[PDB]
Amino acid sequence: KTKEDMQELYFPTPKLIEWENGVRQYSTVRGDTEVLMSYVPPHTNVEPHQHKEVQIGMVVSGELMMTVGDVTRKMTALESAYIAPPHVPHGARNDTDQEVIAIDIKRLKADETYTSPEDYFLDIFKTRDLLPGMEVTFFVEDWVEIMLAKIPGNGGEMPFHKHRNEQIGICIGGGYDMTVEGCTVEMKFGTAYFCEPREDHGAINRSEKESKSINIFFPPRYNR
Numbered sequence: 001k002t003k004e005d006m007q008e009l010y011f012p013t014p015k016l017i018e019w020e021n022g023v024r025q026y027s028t029v030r031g032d033t034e035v036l037m038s039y040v041p042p043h044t045n046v047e048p049h050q051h052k053e054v055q056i057g058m059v060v061s062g063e064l065m066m067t068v069g070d071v072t073r074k075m076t077a078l079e080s081a082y083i084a085p086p087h088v089p090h091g092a093r094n095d096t097d098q099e100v101i102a103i104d105i106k107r108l109k110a111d112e113t114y115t116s117p118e119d120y121f122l123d124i125f126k127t128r129d130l131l132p133g134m135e136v137t138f139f140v141e142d143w144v145e146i147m148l149a150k151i152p153g154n155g156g157e158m159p160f161h162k163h164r165n166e167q168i169g170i171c172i173g174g175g176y177d178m179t180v181e182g183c184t185v186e187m188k189f190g191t192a193y194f195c196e197p198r199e200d201h202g203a204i205n206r207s208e209k210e211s212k213s214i215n216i217f218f219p220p221r222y223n224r
Protein backbone atom coordinates (compact mmCIF):
# COMPACT_ATOMS: atom_id res chain seq x y z
CA LYS A 1 0.00 0.00 0.00
CA THR A 2 2.15 2.93 1.24
CA LYS A 3 5.86 3.42 0.38
CA GLU A 4 7.02 2.60 4.00
CA ASP A 5 4.79 -0.43 4.13
CA MET A 6 6.08 -1.78 0.82
CA GLN A 7 9.69 -0.97 1.85
CA GLU A 8 9.33 -2.90 5.11
CA LEU A 9 7.95 -5.86 3.22
CA TYR A 10 10.35 -6.04 0.35
CA PHE A 11 13.56 -4.46 1.76
CA PRO A 12 13.15 -5.22 5.48
CA THR A 13 15.20 -3.10 7.84
CA PRO A 14 17.99 -5.34 9.30
CA LYS A 15 18.78 -5.90 12.94
CA LEU A 16 22.29 -6.22 14.11
CA ILE A 17 22.99 -9.31 16.19
CA GLU A 18 26.16 -9.57 18.19
CA TRP A 19 27.57 -12.74 19.72
CA GLU A 20 29.88 -13.06 22.73
CA ASN A 21 32.64 -14.53 20.51
CA GLY A 22 32.71 -11.35 18.39
CA VAL A 23 30.65 -12.53 15.36
CA ARG A 24 28.28 -9.76 14.16
CA GLN A 25 25.38 -10.43 11.94
CA TYR A 26 22.81 -8.41 10.02
CA SER A 27 19.54 -10.23 9.98
CA THR A 28 16.63 -9.46 7.62
CA VAL A 29 13.42 -11.43 7.60
CA ARG A 30 10.37 -11.89 5.48
CA GLY A 31 7.86 -14.51 6.74
CA ASP A 32 9.38 -17.96 6.16
CA THR A 33 12.93 -16.83 5.40
CA GLU A 34 15.82 -15.09 7.12
CA VAL A 35 18.92 -13.65 5.43
CA LEU A 36 21.87 -13.26 7.77
CA MET A 37 25.16 -11.54 6.68
CA SER A 38 27.87 -12.46 9.14
CA TYR A 39 31.22 -10.89 9.92
CA VAL A 40 33.31 -13.62 11.52
CA PRO A 41 36.61 -12.46 13.13
CA PRO A 42 40.05 -14.00 12.41
CA HIS A 43 40.87 -17.32 14.22
CA THR A 44 37.29 -17.72 15.52
CA ASN A 45 35.22 -20.88 16.05
CA VAL A 46 31.52 -20.84 15.23
CA GLU A 47 30.17 -23.47 17.54
CA PRO A 48 28.12 -26.20 15.87
CA HIS A 49 24.36 -26.28 16.22
CA GLN A 50 21.38 -27.73 14.40
CA HIS A 51 17.82 -26.55 13.76
CA LYS A 52 14.56 -27.48 12.02
CA GLU A 53 15.12 -24.73 9.38
CA VAL A 54 17.12 -25.52 6.31
CA GLN A 55 20.24 -23.42 5.93
CA ILE A 56 22.11 -22.38 2.80
CA GLY A 57 25.59 -20.78 3.43
CA MET A 58 28.04 -19.05 1.18
CA VAL A 59 31.25 -17.02 1.82
CA VAL A 60 31.38 -13.61 0.28
CA SER A 61 34.82 -12.53 1.37
CA GLY A 62 37.75 -14.42 3.04
CA GLU A 63 38.12 -18.14 3.45
CA LEU A 64 36.13 -20.28 5.96
CA MET A 65 36.55 -23.90 7.16
CA MET A 66 33.00 -25.18 7.19
CA THR A 67 31.69 -28.38 8.66
CA VAL A 68 28.30 -29.82 7.73
CA GLY A 69 27.43 -33.19 9.19
CA ASP A 70 30.69 -35.01 9.05
CA VAL A 71 32.00 -33.16 5.95
CA THR A 72 34.62 -30.40 6.35
CA ARG A 73 35.48 -28.26 3.39
CA LYS A 74 37.31 -25.01 2.81
CA MET A 75 34.91 -22.43 1.42
CA THR A 76 36.32 -19.92 -1.05
CA ALA A 77 34.69 -16.60 -1.59
CA LEU A 78 31.85 -16.62 -4.14
CA GLU A 79 32.89 -20.20 -5.27
CA SER A 80 31.32 -22.16 -2.49
CA ALA A 81 27.92 -22.96 -1.08
CA TYR A 82 26.37 -25.69 1.00
CA ILE A 83 22.98 -26.83 2.15
CA ALA A 84 22.57 -28.08 5.65
CA PRO A 85 19.23 -29.94 5.63
CA PRO A 86 17.00 -29.59 8.65
CA HIS A 87 18.65 -30.95 11.80
CA VAL A 88 22.02 -31.57 10.24
CA PRO A 89 24.67 -30.13 12.63
CA HIS A 90 26.91 -27.47 11.22
CA GLY A 91 29.68 -25.15 12.44
CA ALA A 92 32.82 -23.45 11.16
CA ARG A 93 36.15 -21.89 11.95
CA ASN A 94 37.70 -18.85 10.43
CA ASP A 95 41.24 -20.21 10.52
CA THR A 96 42.76 -17.18 8.86
CA ASP A 97 44.27 -13.88 9.84
CA GLN A 98 41.47 -12.14 7.90
CA GLU A 99 37.80 -11.42 8.59
CA VAL A 100 35.25 -13.65 6.83
CA ILE A 101 32.04 -12.15 5.39
CA ALA A 102 29.35 -14.87 4.81
CA ILE A 103 25.72 -15.08 3.99
CA ASP A 104 23.26 -17.68 5.40
CA ILE A 105 19.69 -18.19 4.37
CA LYS A 106 17.51 -19.91 6.97
CA ARG A 107 14.12 -21.10 5.80
CA LEU A 108 11.16 -23.36 6.58
CA LYS A 109 8.24 -23.18 4.10
CA ALA A 110 5.41 -25.65 3.74
CA ASP A 111 5.59 -28.11 0.99
CA GLU A 112 9.34 -27.87 0.36
CA THR A 113 11.59 -30.94 0.64
CA TYR A 114 15.12 -29.95 1.58
CA THR A 115 17.51 -32.21 -0.34
CA SER A 116 21.24 -31.58 -0.61
CA PRO A 117 24.19 -33.21 -2.31
CA GLU A 118 25.29 -36.26 -0.41
CA ASP A 119 28.22 -34.31 1.05
CA TYR A 120 26.23 -30.96 1.41
CA PHE A 121 28.48 -28.69 -0.60
CA LEU A 122 27.18 -27.65 -3.99
CA ASP A 123 29.23 -27.29 -7.26
CA ILE A 124 29.29 -23.91 -9.03
CA PHE A 125 28.94 -23.65 -12.89
CA LYS A 126 28.69 -20.84 -15.39
CA THR A 127 26.07 -20.47 -18.04
CA ARG A 128 25.59 -18.08 -20.94
CA ASP A 129 24.79 -14.59 -19.76
CA LEU A 130 21.31 -14.08 -18.46
CA LEU A 131 20.96 -10.99 -20.72
CA PRO A 132 23.90 -9.88 -22.76
CA GLY A 133 26.56 -8.46 -20.44
CA MET A 134 24.93 -9.84 -17.31
CA GLU A 135 27.22 -12.77 -16.37
CA VAL A 136 25.80 -15.34 -14.03
CA THR A 137 27.08 -18.30 -12.15
CA PHE A 138 24.87 -20.83 -10.28
CA PHE A 139 24.60 -23.52 -7.69
CA VAL A 140 21.43 -25.58 -8.06
CA GLU A 141 19.53 -28.15 -5.97
CA ASP A 142 15.99 -29.55 -6.52
CA TRP A 143 14.30 -26.84 -4.47
CA VAL A 144 16.71 -23.86 -4.67
CA GLU A 145 18.72 -22.10 -7.30
CA ILE A 146 21.48 -19.63 -6.25
CA MET A 147 22.39 -17.19 -8.97
CA LEU A 148 25.43 -14.86 -8.68
CA ALA A 149 24.88 -11.99 -11.18
CA LYS A 150 27.14 -9.21 -12.18
CA ILE A 151 25.08 -6.25 -13.32
CA PRO A 152 27.22 -3.89 -15.44
CA GLY A 153 27.29 -0.18 -14.66
CA ASN A 154 26.12 2.39 -17.20
CA GLY A 155 22.59 1.00 -17.31
CA GLY A 156 23.07 -2.75 -16.87
CA GLU A 157 19.50 -3.87 -16.26
CA MET A 158 17.12 -6.66 -15.32
CA PRO A 159 13.78 -5.59 -16.91
CA PHE A 160 10.81 -5.42 -14.58
CA HIS A 161 8.92 -8.70 -14.46
CA LYS A 162 7.27 -11.30 -12.28
CA HIS A 163 7.26 -15.11 -11.98
CA ARG A 164 5.82 -17.77 -9.72
CA ASN A 165 9.25 -18.50 -8.25
CA GLU A 166 9.92 -16.82 -4.94
CA GLN A 167 13.13 -14.82 -5.21
CA ILE A 168 15.26 -13.40 -2.40
CA GLY A 169 18.70 -11.77 -2.73
CA ILE A 170 21.42 -9.54 -1.47
CA CYS A 171 23.68 -6.97 -3.08
CA ILE A 172 27.30 -8.05 -2.50
CA GLY A 173 29.10 -5.28 -4.50
CA GLY A 174 28.83 -1.62 -5.03
CA GLY A 175 25.25 -0.75 -5.65
CA TYR A 176 22.31 -0.40 -7.99
CA ASP A 177 18.64 0.46 -7.86
CA MET A 178 16.33 -2.42 -7.19
CA THR A 179 12.58 -2.21 -7.41
CA VAL A 180 9.91 -4.42 -5.99
CA GLU A 181 6.35 -3.56 -6.91
CA GLY A 182 6.01 0.12 -6.04
CA CYS A 183 9.23 0.58 -4.12
CA THR A 184 12.74 1.31 -5.47
CA VAL A 185 15.69 1.19 -3.08
CA GLU A 186 19.27 2.09 -3.76
CA MET A 187 21.06 -1.22 -2.84
CA LYS A 188 24.32 -1.07 -0.84
CA PHE A 189 26.65 -3.90 0.15
CA GLY A 190 24.56 -6.15 2.39
CA THR A 191 21.08 -4.84 1.43
CA ALA A 192 18.65 -7.85 1.19
CA TYR A 193 15.32 -8.00 -0.88
CA PHE A 194 12.45 -10.55 -0.61
CA CYS A 195 9.97 -11.17 -3.45
CA GLU A 196 7.03 -13.49 -2.88
CA PRO A 197 5.63 -15.40 -5.94
CA ARG A 198 4.35 -12.97 -8.59
CA GLU A 199 5.59 -9.73 -7.08
CA ASP A 200 7.02 -7.64 -9.90
CA HIS A 201 10.67 -6.67 -9.58
CA GLY A 202 13.62 -5.43 -11.70
CA ALA A 203 16.96 -3.61 -11.19
CA ILE A 204 19.09 -1.05 -12.90
CA ASN A 205 22.75 -0.23 -12.25
CA ARG A 206 23.21 3.50 -13.05
CA SER A 207 26.57 3.77 -11.35
CA GLU A 208 29.84 3.79 -13.22
CA LYS A 209 30.87 0.34 -12.06
CA GLU A 210 29.56 -3.27 -12.03
CA SER A 211 27.71 -4.49 -8.98
CA LYS A 212 27.26 -8.10 -7.87
CA SER A 213 24.25 -9.72 -6.31
CA ILE A 214 23.30 -13.16 -4.99
CA ASN A 215 19.74 -13.98 -6.11
CA ILE A 216 18.02 -17.13 -4.87
CA PHE A 217 14.99 -18.82 -6.48
CA PHE A 218 12.56 -21.14 -4.68
CA PRO A 219 12.14 -23.33 -6.69
CA PRO A 220 14.69 -23.07 -9.50
CA ARG A 221 13.84 -20.85 -12.29
CA TYR A 222 16.63 -21.38 -14.90
CA ASN A 223 18.24 -24.75 -14.23
CA ARG A 224 15.05 -26.75 -13.68
Ligand SMILES: O=C(O)C(=O)Cc1ccccc1
Pocket residue numbers: 149151158163167178201202203213215221
Ligand atom coordinates in the same frame (compact mmCIF):
# COMPACT_ATOMS: atom_id res chain seq x y z
O1 LIG B 1 16.20 -13.64 -13.31
C1 LIG B 1 15.37 -13.07 -12.53
O2 LIG B 1 14.20 -13.40 -12.22
C2 LIG B 1 15.75 -11.87 -11.80
O3 LIG B 1 15.00 -11.23 -11.11
C3 LIG B 1 17.21 -11.53 -11.81
C4 LIG B 1 17.76 -10.34 -11.09
C5 LIG B 1 19.16 -10.20 -11.15
C6 LIG B 1 19.78 -9.10 -10.57
C7 LIG B 1 19.05 -8.13 -9.92
C8 LIG B 1 17.67 -8.28 -9.86
C9 LIG B 1 17.03 -9.37 -10.42
Ligand SMILES: [Co+2]
Pocket residue numbers: 049050051055090
Ligand atom coordinates in the same frame (compact mmCIF):
# COMPACT_ATOMS: atom_id res chain seq x y z
CO1 LIG C 1 22.57 -22.73 11.45
Ligand SMILES: [Co+2]
Pocket residue numbers: 163167201
Ligand atom coordinates in the same frame (compact mmCIF):
# COMPACT_ATOMS: atom_id res chain seq x y z
CO1 LIG D 1 13.18 -12.37 -11.07
Ligand SMILES: [Fe+3]
Pocket residue numbers: 030031032033109166196
Ligand atom coordinates in the same frame (compact mmCIF):
# COMPACT_ATOMS: atom_id res chain seq x y z
FE1 LIG E 1 8.33 -16.88 1.65
Ligand SMILES: [Fe+3]
Pocket residue numbers: 154206207208
Ligand atom coordinates in the same frame (compact mmCIF):
# COMPACT_ATOMS: atom_id res chain seq x y z
FE1 LIG F 1 27.67 6.25 -16.88
